[model samples]
Structures are given as C-alpha cells and as structure tokens.
Target: VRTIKVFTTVDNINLHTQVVDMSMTYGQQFGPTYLDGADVTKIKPHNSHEGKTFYVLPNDDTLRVEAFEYYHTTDPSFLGRYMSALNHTKKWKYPQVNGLTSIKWADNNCYLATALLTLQQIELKFNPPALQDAYYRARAGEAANFCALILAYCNKTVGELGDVRETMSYLFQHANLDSCKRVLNVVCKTCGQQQTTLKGVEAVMYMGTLSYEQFKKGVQIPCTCGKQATKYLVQQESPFVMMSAPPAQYELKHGTFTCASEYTGNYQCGHYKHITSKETLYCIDGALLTKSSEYKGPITDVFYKENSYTT
Candidate 1:
C-alpha cells in the first residue's frame, strides 16, 4: 500500500506490455490499472507520458481486475483530490484493457456516467420538490465542499431516466452538465445530503477520462441562466439562469449521460438488453403500435433491447 507514478508512451507500449504483465499491474476492459493504496510496484517508461500520476493498489489474484473507487462523500479536500484524479487520467487509452463496452470512449464514459446516475439516485431519495432545481451540486457529499452546488437543465429532457422519467424528459434537452453540477450542488446542500463518487471500474469501460480544464472548471461552474442573470443584476431566463463558483476542485460529468434507446415499460433493463432482440413488436424501432396495429408517432431510437419476458 503505497502510491507511485508510471510513465508510458503509445509507441513504447510493447516494451512496457511485458512489464505490465510481470508487475501484475495490467488492466481489464477499462484498460490498465491505476491503483491507489496498493503496494508500489515497478513502472515502465512511456515515450512522453511521463510526469503523469498513477497511484498503485493491491491486485492480489482476487482483485484480478485492479479498479478505482472514489471515496463516497468524504469532504471538500477529498472532492478536490477526486478532481485531480479525474483530469490526470484523460490522455491515456487502453487497447488491451479488458471489460470495456462501446460507450467507454464516447461522452458516455462509464466512470462519470455512474457518478451522474448515482448522483440522481441520491437525489431521488433526498432532493425535495422545493429545492430539486436550485442547489443540487451541494449534494456533492461529505465529500461536498465547505460549499456545494445543485443544477438542472433548461430543456429538462437531458438527464437520462427510467420509464417514468420519459414524460419528464421530452422538453429536457437543455439540461447541460456544465451548469447542472452547480445546480446539483445547491440542491444537495439545502437538503443536507451528500453523494459519493462511485467505484471506478478497471479499463476504459465508458471512455471516461478528465482534462485539466475539466478538473479546473469542475471546481467552479457557470450556468448560462445564472451567469447572464448575475451579470445584469436582474433575474431572467424563466426560473432564473444560474451558476456557481465551486469553492473546491470541480468534478463535472461533462455532458449529461443518456442511453441511445428508451424503454417500452416501467422497469430498468440490463446493458446486455441493448444487444438482444424482442419477439413482439408492440413498437417498431421507436414508435408505439396502436390497437389498430399501425405504427403511429415518432419512431424512438431508444428501443427495447431484449425479450426476456417472452418464452
């Protein structure tokens, strides 16, 4: 249980590949392991990826997959650290990393994706209707800064939701993550609650990496609505466009995390459900078939991925 930084390069990957293997520090689908609290082991050279920080962790066989887990709801100091870790890992990619899914690289980074979703999961229970929109980021957790933030979207359809969340999403696209984190913090602080950054899976499961700006900006967020309002010293933008200067490091999920397809019913589906098929076409593609048996309405790109119910 010690920490150290390793440097590697794209061209010199082969040279380090065996080193990674020998060190037992290789990663899974999410790519290589960047452990924390694990014993410091040997590190390989990267042509230019030096000075990049990577913490070490124990991978004793059981942890066949070395992973990451941001301390859930620690304190402001911890939140700052989270921001640093998020940004430092952005430049690297793992071709040989295991456990990866398609969205791992796109805006749909699983690491941030989980944080976004987990944040919502926390909100569903604590964020009351009165403060849901104003200060959601405050819910950042014990990990929440001495200050916190809470933000929501203008369109309202942006944040990914389950079946019940659909009706709420139609006009929700304006919910940009840039401002949403601030919104989220405010809501959290008011409710006196906190959210923990979830476990970071090994490999690049969702292409979730961070950049300096991302970390820096995440610390203090600005919302179009909030910014423009404060600038003129008058409230505008419907509910009042809002933004906040996060006291500590900002950890933004960047854009909102949404699924490509939607559901036909009221429950959540598994990731595998997406790749599978359905027996009955109650809906075709994205449209619902009416009693008359005709496909009527906008076809939904979000479709039912599986037919587990069918025998």
Candidate 2:
C-alpha cells in the first residue's frame, strides 16, 4: 500500500519482459513461493500518475516507473513467522567455502542475499530480556557466524544497528573467519570470582578479526592498579609499584663459614639467601630456599652452616 518506485535498465526488450518475474522475486509480498501464491496484477496510481505511464529518458538506458503503489504484506511479524518456519523445515546451511571456514562470494548471487535478508528479519523482531536464551538460540542452530553475529546484534545492539545493509557490507569487508567459529566465548565484566569469560550464548560476541589494540578500546578491562586493589584492602592503599634488586650481594663463598678445607667442591655456597645450589645444602637455609617457599626477610640476614659444620 506504500508508494513505490520501480526503475529498470535493460538494453534488450526480451529481457525487459521479465520485469514481472523480477518484481515477484524482489517483492517481499509473495509468500511460500515467489510467483504461485503472490498476486502481481495491479498498480495503483498516485497524484499525477493517473493512468500508469513509464518514461524513457534521453540517455536511452533507463526506464522509470514513478508514483506507483504495489501490494505487499503489511505486518512485519508475518514475514518473521514465515522465515522462522523455513528455518526449521528447510535443510539449508549458510553458504560457505570448501573448508567451511569462511563465507562464499556473491557473484552470480547464489545464497548471499538470502542469508543477509534473513538476518534483517531476525533483527527486526528479536524480543528482549533473555534475548540470547529466548530468541537467539532458537534460530541460531543452523546459522553461520554471520547469522549468529546478527543475532548477537539483535540481542545486544552495538556498532551498526541502524542500517543492517551497511553493517552486513562492513562485516564482509572486515570479517574474521575465526569469529565465525560459531562458539560464543566472550568476556564478561567480572574476570574473577565475581565474573569471568562467558560461555554459551550469554557471552558478548566480539569480532575475532579485529586487531587486538583495536578491540582493547571497546572492552572494559580494569587498570593494573585497580586490579591489585581488588585483591586486598591494604594493597588498595599503597601497593609496591615495582621491584628493586635484592639487598644482599650474591657472592658465593667457597668454604663453610664454620670450617674451611673440610669440604671443597664437595659443595658450593653463595649468599645463603642467593644459593644457586641445586637444592639448599644447609639444613638451616633449606626452609627458606625451597621452590615452594617464599622469603620476605632482609636478604643480608640469612646465614648458612654446612650439615657437617655445626659447631
């Protein structure tokens, strides 16, 4: 019932006769099948276009039919219901390449427009709240990275929701095959006990193809200092900014502090705190030097005596 404009440019008269067929296909009015079920007979005239006239211009390549109205379904939900039905019953997969890793090209136009248009349908009708659980998962089973992506946008609107056609084109130009892996592994606000990377459809979808630096700007990652503050209340006040060198000189003494020449090359010793021995040789230093132990004392205070050198 809306005003319509049909502009066709065809060099040959024979191909021009196929206008009705073309209209049937492009017009969303047709249901089930493009031709058999849909009626394409009448053209309502508006304002000056009273008797249905088409004009041929001086350029001689374009034919314009202006101020005409065509019949089409009024309710958008009608198309949504119809598409939802085909989604389940049809044995169709999103068009992809030989490896199924990426999308196919749109040269002769096989499955490209159909896939994008279908996305537009879902975007228009997706209900909210539990959008991912209620709406997305229902239709995303047979869909591709592209389809799930549009669903992602429907459930959670981000960059480009205004013009779906522009969004689709932009995605194609800078698409990531890995993002199309069809798994929803997105980061949640909380990256720790309070939060984590979200799995399943609840996760926020990110374009895997974007460069790391580019994505960093769009996400919410707390600064390093803020993260430390979360770990402990004291850390929040005055945490160490950086590490400095150990206080003790790491000088290795050849003999035991107690006995000399008792053991030569039989053992090696460094600043007992700095002992690079395979295992701490001194029983006294052993507790602090184990890989699992942490030492917080001044490095210079550590003293060592060989197992056999105890006075």
Candidate 3:
C-alpha cells in the first residue's frame, strides 16, 4: 500500500517526474524501502535517506534510484503494527513501507523479493494464542470452506490488532495525561535464598503508565540476585505491575525491571494480556488434567507504534 516517488532530471525539469504506486503495478504487497528502478536507460537513483549507495547512478549509462532509509528498528511507528500484523502469519516477511520505487512496474518483484527477510520482532511478541490459531488455521486448506471457518477470522484478528495499535498510539500521542502521571522507580526485597519479593505499583498515564495488571503472572526486573546486587531476575509475584508507555520510554524503567513470577504473561503495552494456565489445570500428581477453557497463544511479538508514525 506504499507509493514510491520518482524524480528524474534530463534538462533538470521537475515536470518529467512521476510517482509510482507499486501495489498496483506489482501483485506483491511488500518489499525494500529503496532500490534500483529499471534496467532501461530511463531514470537513475537520485538520493537516499541513509547511505549514498541507496541510489546508484552509473557514471555514464547507469541510472540510479535511491532507497528510503527504511527503519529496521524497534520503533513502533515503523514496525510495531506492521510486524504485529505479520507475526506467525503465512507471509514469511514484513511488507515494504512507503517510498518504494521501480521501473516497468514488473521491477516491484525485486522489492518484494528483498523485503521478505525483515522478521517480526517486538510486534510478533504481542500475538495472542487465539489469533495465532486463526492465522494457522486459515491456511489449513485453500478451499472455500476454509476461508469462512478460519481465513476470515485470521484477517479480522490481524486487522483488529492493527486498529488497536493505532488507537493506542493516539491515546499516547494526544492525551493530556502527563500531569496525571508520577515518576516511578522499582523497590524490591528478598524473601529467602530461592525466592524474592516486590511491592507492585500502577500507571495512570498512557505512555508512562505502569500498573499491577501489567504483570499478572510474573515480570522481570533488575534486582539483587543472591549476593549479586546488580542483576536482572525474573520474579513471579502475586501482585504484578501493569505497564504502558511510548515504545522508547517503556522498558525496564530508569533503574528497574519488575516481574511477578518465573512464569511470564506478556501485556501488549497493556492492551492484550498473555498469561499461562494455572498449575491446578495440569494436575501434577495423577490428578485429572483440567485445562482452562480459554485458549491463548503461548507467545508472540507485541509491538506498539509511536505517535509520530501516524501524522
């Protein structure tokens, strides 16, 4: 769905330039941010967002087109929603972002070919078990019935995830919640040789907000591990911390990363909560295996795009 703008100068005339929409030209939906456009002596790369090599212009006959400085980053705006949409799906890679260019339209295949390697990272972590099941099931068979039972659900779920990311992005961007938040720091105490204890807190602000719900099952925080004072230990405390924030500002906080238990349930920026089944369900000693009716995916990336990526 991204368009690549092309600028060519023969007599230094801007009128000769035109924008190319790769989606229409190429059946493929994704590819690299920037690359060469055509094999013919038509248009050469101009300039790129990053390195000088982005747009290659042959000394004489070589025409060069520039590639966009695509964000191969953890930024949510760049890859958050996009990667979440692609996680555990049939697609092997992320779809290309805007600013893709090519000549003869057929050249878009090259972009698609190159874009197939960008694996899902953060956003992939957000995928819930149900969504993953739907995604996998959609591809179970190509028959008409398959689309109804699974494919439709898969499409719906992915779209919902993207929509939710956008919604969360908005709340973080424009919401007047800064004054509503208080600066937080982690404080933990040891229980015994093998266990640790922590006092959990919550966040009121969208981006800077952290609450108990964020760590229902467990969390990982930098705490004293035995004698190792400065160590990161994942703890599964009962009262967990719920967290939300601008993707950049959100990690282990300034000096602490909090966790509730060794068993971790991920909260997608406080949007979707992924938790493990209770121990009682497994029925350890010859007890009947009682599974929770709720079906949640074991794990997937959960990325939240920032406010800047929108407007």
- The lDDT for every candidate, in the order shown, is 0.23, 0.25, 0.25
Per-residue lDDT of 1-311 in model 3, one digit per residue for the tens?
A: 44565543211111223454543421121122222222222333333411222222212222212111121122223222332333323322222222111111121122111111111111121122322333243333211121121212223333232222233332223222332222222435562323333331112212232333343323444455543222122333221122343333122211132210011223432222222223211111111122343332321212222121100
lDDT of each residue in 129-182, candidate 1, tens digit only: 212332243233221211111111111111223232222231122132222211
RMSD of 3: 18.0
Report the poorest 10 consecutive residues by lDDT, candidate 3.
113-122
Q: Global lDDT for candidate 1? A: 0.23
Q: Among all windows of ten consecutive residues in candidate 2, which has the lowest summed lDDT?
A: 233-242
Q: What TM-score does structure 2 among the candidates reach?
A: 0.19
Candidate 2 structure quality by residue, lDDT tens digits, 17-122: 2222322333332222211112222323233422222322212222222101110222323223322333322333433221121222222111222234223222
- TM-score, candidate 1, is 0.19
Instruction: List the candidate 1 regions with Cα displacement exceeding 4 Å.
Output: 1-32, 35-43, 58-262, 265-311
Runs off by more than 4 Å, candidate 2: 1-193, 196-199, 207-311
